Design a protein around this ligand. Structure first.
Ligand SMILES: *Cc1cc2c(nc3c(=O)[nH]c(=O)nc-3n2C[C@H](O)[C@H](O)[C@H](O)COP(=O)(O)OP(=O)(O)OC[C@H]2O[C@@H](n3cnc4c(N)ncnc43)[C@H](O)[C@@H]2O)c(*)c1C
Length: 486
């Protein structure tokens, strides 16, 4: 372990992660970062921190949207980012240590055994937060969530007597903690050192990437509603069919100041080839090219899968971000389409909303296996679209404008009629929505006493997680603004 305290030249860099908002103040910053050099460092590093009464937060790839890692006033960040070399065995079993970044992981899994894991696209996201939060990406309609493949988890927990020790959890060993590690989100129960997979799916051989853009200059409320109708009605119907599960679409409903709305679709057949583009052609044909809604000319480019996966792996700039999430079981209502149009066309004097957007992901397919409700901590297994509201900016001086823009936008979309008065402002689970995604955490939801039901559903999961919390972190060593409460 390397100790990076405030005397160390690395401190100013290592006190933060990807989102430059955190820590908000120097007072809130960690006093030190414990950079673990091997898995065997983790329990002793943790033991040293808690033995002094200091609080640990936990970092792997640093991508947390919220202050969960970096807001730890004069505490210790236990950093597992150097624990990054996957083990891909000749028998196809895989171990992904927590610091493995998504793209490095895809390269290793692909080259060593023609395997992949259906997680996120961003190159720099770490396994540690990503997988236990229920990570998904462009292959998840085909192959399900990252957590749907997990066979075992190596985790350091702290017992009632305050002793940190490694354990391995799986279907028969601490099975309730295993289930919690399959989606509940990080920084809750202990420090995951590695994820084990008895089997992974084969990497696809070939994909097509289709880009369809729409000029904002021509985008009326009616054309915008037609775009949302065509897209959402597809995922609610045809997109449930298995022959479509290799198709994954990102509709970037940009703020008007971005100039264009962009839809990026990846496609393979279920067998991982592009032997038949019919499903993609049929999907794209719903979006008529100009040369009433009409698009810029469609671009469809074929790649081998690894090459496409590299070309889409960007993380965007290192800057300030605010994010929100919603799971949709249905197409857009006319009221949703109108409220979204309102906020995407709203001018806010003194701030640049050109990087801001509502992203609407195709969802469901192989995710939507109800047997995973009982053995994972991802209860949202009936959604057809997954939404990520995003605003990005450079300067702390502009925080208030950006937070207000995205806060008002979200509250309005999920307001009265489509949502009950008691839950208004949230995509509360029911006939229309399935709530929120813990890997896109939103501390604005702490304003609502029912925030745990947004993330963990209206059923018994949160109480289950509270029981795991009492059993495996009885001292509440591991916490943050949205951690499972004892
Ligand atoms: C920055 C970023 C995030 C993205 C991106 N694209 C995603 C995508 O395509 N699919 C997704 O499903 N999610 C995407 N996300 C969001 C990420 O999934 C989340 O931001 C992950 O939680 C990030 O994980 P990581 O990079 O490890 O982030 P940290 O900030 O280190 O920790 C997050 C969270 O988890 C806890 N924690 C970290 N490490 C551990 C370990 N080893 N054990 C337990 N708990 C751990 C932290 O306490 C914190 O709560 C694309 C981009 C650009």
């Amino acid at each position: 372990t390397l100790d990076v305290s405030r005397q160390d030249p690395r401190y100013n860099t290592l006190k933060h992660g990807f989102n430059l908002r955190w820590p908000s103040t120097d007072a809130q910053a960690a006093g030190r970062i414990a950079l673990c050099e091997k898995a065997d460092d983790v329990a002793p590093a943790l033991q040293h921190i808690i033995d002094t009464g200091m609080r640990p937060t936990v970092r792997s790839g640093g991508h947390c949207y919220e202050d969960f890692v970096s807001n730890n006033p004069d505490g210790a960040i236990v950093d597992l980012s150097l624990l990054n070399a996957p083990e891909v065995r000749a028998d196809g079993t895989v171990r992904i240590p927590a610091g493995t970044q998504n793209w490095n992981g895809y390269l290793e899994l692909y080259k060593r055994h023609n395997l992949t894991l259906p997680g996120g696209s961003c190159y720099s996201v770490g396994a540690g937060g990503h997988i236990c939060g229920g990570g998904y990406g462009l292959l998840s309609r085909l192959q399900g969530l990252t957590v749907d493949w997990l066979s075992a988890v190596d985790i350091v927990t702290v017992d009632r007597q305050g002793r940190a020790a490694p354990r391995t959890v799986d279907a028969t060993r601490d099975p309730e903690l295993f289930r919690a590690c399959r989606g509940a989100g990080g920084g809750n129960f202990g420090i995951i050192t590695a994820y084990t997979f008895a089997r992974l799916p084969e990497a696809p051989r070939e994909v097509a990437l289709a880009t369809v853009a729409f000029d904002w200059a021509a985008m009326t409320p009616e054309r915008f509603a037609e775009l949302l109708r065509l897209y959402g009605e597809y995922w609610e119907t045809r997109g449930k069919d298995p022959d479509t599960w290799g198709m994954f679409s990102l509709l970037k409903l940009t703020h008007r100041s971005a100039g264009q709305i962009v839809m990026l679709t990846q496609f393979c057949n279920p067998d991982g080839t592009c032997r038949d583009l019919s499903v993609l052609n049929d999907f794209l044909a719903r979006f008529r090219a100009c040369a009433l809604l009409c698009s810029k000319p469609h671009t469809v480019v074929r790649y081998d899968w690894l090459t496409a996966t590299q070309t889409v792996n960007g993380s965007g700039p290192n800057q300030r971000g605010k994010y929100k999430s919603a799971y949709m079981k249905r197409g857009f209502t006319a009221r949703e389409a109108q409220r979204i149009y309102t906020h995407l066309t709203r001018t806010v004097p003194g701030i640049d909303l050109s990087q801001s957007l509502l992203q609407v992901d195709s969802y469901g397919g192989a995710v939507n296996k109800t047997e995973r409700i009982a053995d994972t901590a991802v209860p949202q297994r009936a959604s057809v679209m997954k939404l990520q509201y995003q605003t990005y900016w450079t300067s702390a001086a502009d925080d208030a404008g950006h937070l207000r823009w995205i806060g008002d936008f979200y509250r309005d979309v999920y307001g009265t009629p489509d949502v009950s008065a008691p839950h208004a402002g949230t995509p509360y689970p029911g006939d229309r929505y399935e709530g929120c995604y813990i890997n896109y955490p939103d501390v604005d939801m702490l304003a609502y006493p029912f925030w745990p039901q947004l993330y963990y559903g209206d059923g018994d999961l949160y109480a289950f997680l509270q029981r795991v919390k009492r059993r495996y972190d009885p001292n509440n060593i591991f916490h943050h603004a949205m951690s499972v409460r004892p």
